[PDB]
Design an enzyme around this catalytic site. Structure first.
Site, PDB file in Angstrom:
ATOM      1  N   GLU A  11      17.450   8.854 -24.436  1.00 34.20           N
ATOM      2  CA  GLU A  11      17.569   9.390 -23.086  1.00 34.20           C
ATOM      3  C   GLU A  11      16.258   9.522 -22.327  1.00 34.20           C
ATOM      4  O   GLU A  11      16.283   9.593 -21.125  1.00 34.20           O
ATOM      5  CB  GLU A  11      18.162  10.789 -23.158  1.00 34.20           C
ATOM      6  CG  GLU A  11      19.546  10.742 -23.736  1.00 34.20           C
ATOM      7  CD  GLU A  11      20.592  10.155 -22.841  1.00 34.20           C
ATOM      8  OE1 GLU A  11      20.160   9.868 -21.635  1.00 34.20           O
ATOM      9  OE2 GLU A  11      21.759  10.030 -23.229  1.00 34.20           O
ATOM     10  N   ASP A  20      20.682   8.652 -13.212  1.00 32.97           N
ATOM     11  CA  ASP A  20      20.883   7.979 -14.450  1.00 32.97           C
ATOM     12  C   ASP A  20      21.295   6.486 -14.227  1.00 32.97           C
ATOM     13  O   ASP A  20      21.390   5.998 -13.079  1.00 32.97           O
ATOM     14  CB  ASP A  20      21.769   8.807 -15.390  1.00 32.97           C
ATOM     15  CG  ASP A  20      23.237   8.744 -15.075  1.00 32.97           C
ATOM     16  OD1 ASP A  20      23.516   8.112 -13.989  1.00 32.97           O
ATOM     17  OD2 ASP A  20      24.100   9.243 -15.755  1.00 32.97           O
ATOM     18  N   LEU A  32      23.254  15.692 -17.476  1.00 30.75           N
ATOM     19  CA  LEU A  32      23.855  15.326 -16.186  1.00 30.75           C
ATOM     20  C   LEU A  32      24.081  16.521 -15.307  1.00 30.75           C
ATOM     21  O   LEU A  32      24.590  17.537 -15.770  1.00 30.75           O
ATOM     22  CB  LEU A  32      25.208  14.584 -16.413  1.00 30.75           C
ATOM     23  CG  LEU A  32      26.063  14.548 -15.134  1.00 30.75           C
ATOM     24  CD1 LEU A  32      25.608  13.429 -14.224  1.00 30.75           C
ATOM     25  CD2 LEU A  32      27.491  14.290 -15.515  1.00 30.75           C
ATOM     26  N   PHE A 104      27.520  12.590 -26.777  1.00 25.34           N
ATOM     27  CA  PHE A 104      26.585  13.122 -25.815  1.00 25.34           C
ATOM     28  C   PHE A 104      26.557  12.316 -24.532  1.00 25.34           C
ATOM     29  O   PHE A 104      26.557  12.804 -23.427  1.00 25.34           O
ATOM     30  CB  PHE A 104      25.197  13.017 -26.516  1.00 25.34           C
ATOM     31  CG  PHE A 104      24.112  13.678 -25.750  1.00 25.34           C
ATOM     32  CD1 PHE A 104      23.463  12.966 -24.743  1.00 25.34           C
ATOM     33  CD2 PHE A 104      23.722  15.001 -26.002  1.00 25.34           C
ATOM     34  CE1 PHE A 104      22.401  13.551 -24.025  1.00 25.34           C
ATOM     35  CE2 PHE A 104      22.672  15.602 -25.292  1.00 25.34           C
ATOM     36  CZ  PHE A 104      22.015  14.870 -24.296  1.00 25.34           C
ATOM     37  N   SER A 117      38.026   1.525 -33.046  1.00 27.20           N
ATOM     38  CA  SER A 117      36.745   1.692 -33.706  1.00 27.20           C
ATOM     39  C   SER A 117      36.779   2.944 -34.568  1.00 27.20           C
ATOM     40  O   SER A 117      36.177   2.950 -35.618  1.00 27.20           O
ATOM     41  CB  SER A 117      35.641   1.939 -32.706  1.00 27.20           C
ATOM     42  OG  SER A 117      35.532   0.794 -31.884  1.00 27.20           O
ATOM     43  N   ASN A 132      34.139  -4.225 -32.950  1.00 28.93           N
ATOM     44  CA  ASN A 132      35.027  -3.593 -31.978  1.00 28.93           C
ATOM     45  C   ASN A 132      34.279  -2.690 -30.968  1.00 28.93           C
ATOM     46  O   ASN A 132      34.634  -2.582 -29.779  1.00 28.93           O
ATOM     47  CB  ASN A 132      36.086  -2.744 -32.699  1.00 28.93           C
ATOM     48  CG  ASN A 132      37.178  -2.229 -31.778  1.00 28.93           C
ATOM     49  OD1 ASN A 132      37.151  -1.086 -31.247  1.00 28.93           O
ATOM     50  ND2 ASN A 132      38.173  -3.104 -31.525  1.00 28.93           N
TER      51      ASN A 132
END
Ligand code: CL
Ligand code: CL
Length: 162
Positions: A11, A20, A32, A104, A117, A132
């Site tokens: 990040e 972002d 965020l 996250f 998945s 996948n």
């Protein structure tokens, strides 16, 4: 290496409000603030989050405090999510970290939808899961970060982060 370090690499760290990869206002270590197009709305969400008039700037300590809450909230949402928990409980330490990273990034709901998945991860079919996972908007929009997480699930090592 650990979750914190891992996410800190994915990040980054920004002390002023920034947009972002999706154009949303964010701050710190991927915190965020809002999906609204308004900076004022971002500034307000920011002051509410820190508990002070920030003028859209925070300190490192403040960024770290938001990060700690965010990581904690992610783990906790995994544990409460009926689709996520069984997966997380089945995994080893390193792969648990990769599931937390995705949560996250995308939110619990977003993750709970990778039905296919999830099932492969849970069955320990590494390569199948990796293939996948790659068939997703997630992989196409942020490929380098996705490859890092995917490799993490594939190998169960931190190699992609060294
Ligand atoms: Cl097992
Ligand atoms: Cl696709």
């Amino acid at each position: 290496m650990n979750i914190f370090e891992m996410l800190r690499i994915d990040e980054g760290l920004r002390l002023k409000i920034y947009k972002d990869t999706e154009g949303y206002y964010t701050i710190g270590i991927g915190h965020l603030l809002t999906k609204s197009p308004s900076l004022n709305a971002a500034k307000s969400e920011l002051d509410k989050a820190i508990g002070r008039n920030t003028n859209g700037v925070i300190t490192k300590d403040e960024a770290e405090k938001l990060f700690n809450q965010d990581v904690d909230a992610a783990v906790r949402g995994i544990l409460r999510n009926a689709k996520l928990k069984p997966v997380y409980d089945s995994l080893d330490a390193v792969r648990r970290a990769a599931l937390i990273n995705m949560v996250f990034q995308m939110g619990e709901t977003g993750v709970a939808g990778f039905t296919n998945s999830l099932r492969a991860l849970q069955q320990k079919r590494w390569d199948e899961a990796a293939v996948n996972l790659a068939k997703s908007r997630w992989y196409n929009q942020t490929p380098n970060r996705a490859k890092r997480v995917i490799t993490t699930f594939r190998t169960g090592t931190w190699d992609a982060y060294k």
